[PDB]
Design a protein around this ligand. Structure first.
Ligand SMILES: [Zn+2]
Length: 360
């Protein structure tokens, strides 16, 4: 096609909410700059560029929204991948330093690779006054009609477009709200032993430092995450095991890490956590699980090895469920209404855990 545009191939390669991740870390970006006016027949200035790194042409519009008389701008990004850790931080800084510009980003794929600095950068970019959404059918349809040299060819979506779009929107909302959905918590954090449809695994984590003679909660370190499964993926415990290194814990001070898990760790995750806590002796790791993942009879050895290495394994009760509801979900002031059979299943799983811990 002509210069400055992309073709159906590059579009269908960069803009896709499907399991095919990214062998090559490239990111395409389509920008629409418009003068913030009252009219609907305004001239929308459209451009697009891929990540060249050496020269950075994707930020060529930065000079296009400079302070000129009394003009405001409504920039719209149609970025392929999600912004980088540093790109989002610098964009938030620019938005703070330029009040005459508003920003609306439509992301197609979220950086599944998690990082507290990345999440903090996204939340700060959202705090600076920018809107962030996930591309749906209308966004891909509009981008295909203006930034692709389609020789009279209409847009043809993929099968699981909305199915992946809603899941990515849920993950986005979890990232930006800094809290999981209430229905998601009620669904995944159930208490019955045998359940169906709980494919994913969520995990909340809290950190407490030992100061004076008590456990002072490091409130800026509490968080939560989910599994990725999916490209393939790991489990929730393994995904949590490489977030601890980014915490930069002191080594001659002791800490307590509390992990509220929807599913109990499997055998591989149990052995990995056992090795981790055998290496890091300055962290006391306690696990409160809602359900006991049987793991086809291989989880008893994992739990016993974890307890041997040194952990306080226990089953979540009403108090832990209520604490997780009040601290981790977007309840918006609503109380924690427990489901039927809470204490019954809690004490049943407590007795079962007791039986498993005594080599039985
Ligand atoms: Zn596992």
């Amino acid at each position: 096609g002509p210069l400055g545009s992309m073709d159906p191939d590059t579009f269908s390669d960069n803009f896709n909410n499907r399991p095919i991740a990214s062998r090559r870390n490239t990111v395409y970006l389509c920008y629409e700059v418009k003068t913030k006016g009252p009219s609907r027949d305004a001239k929308i200035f459209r451009g697009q560029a891929a990540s060249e790194d050496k020269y950075h042409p994707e930020m060529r519009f930065l000079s296009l929204v400079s302070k000129w008389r009394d003009q405001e701008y409504e920039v719209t990004w149609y970025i392929s991948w999600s912004p980088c850790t540093k790109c989002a931080r610098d964009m938030a800084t620019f938005l703070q330093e330029n009040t005459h510009v508003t920003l609306t980003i439509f992301v197609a794929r979220l950086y599944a690779a998690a990082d507290p600095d990345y999440q903090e950068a996204l939340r700060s970019l959202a705090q600076a006054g920018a809107t962030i959404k996930i591309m749906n059918y209308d966004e891909f349809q509009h981008c295909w009609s203006k930034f692709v040299y389609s020789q009279g060819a209409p847009f043809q979506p993929w099968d699981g477009l909305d199915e992946h779009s809603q899941a990515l929107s849920g993950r986005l909302g979890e990232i930006l709200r800094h809290s999981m959905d209430a229905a998601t918590f009620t669904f995944n954090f159930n208490n019955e032993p045998w359940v169906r449809g709980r494919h994913e695994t969520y995990l909340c984590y809290e950190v407490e430092r030992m100061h004076n003679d008590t456990w002072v909660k490091l409130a800026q370190r509490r968080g939560f995450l989910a599994n990725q499964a999916k490209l393939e993926g790991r489990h929730a415990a393994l995904c949590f095991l490489d977030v601890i290194p980014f915490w930069k814990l002191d080594l001659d001070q002791d800490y307590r890490v509390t992990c509220f898990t929807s599913w109990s760790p499997c055998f591989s995750c149990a052995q990995e956590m056992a090795k981790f806590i055998s290496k890091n002796k300055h962290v006391s790791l306690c696990i409160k699980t809602a359900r006991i993942y049987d793991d086809k009879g291989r989880a008893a050895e994992g739990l016993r090895t974890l307890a041997e290495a040194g952990a306080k394994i226990s089953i979540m009760t009403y108090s832990e469920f209520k604490h997780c509801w009040d601290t981790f979900v977007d309840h918006q002031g609503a109380p924690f209404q427990p489901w039927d059979g809470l204490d019954e299943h809690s004490q049943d799983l407590s007795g079962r855990l007791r039986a498993i811990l005594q080599n039985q």
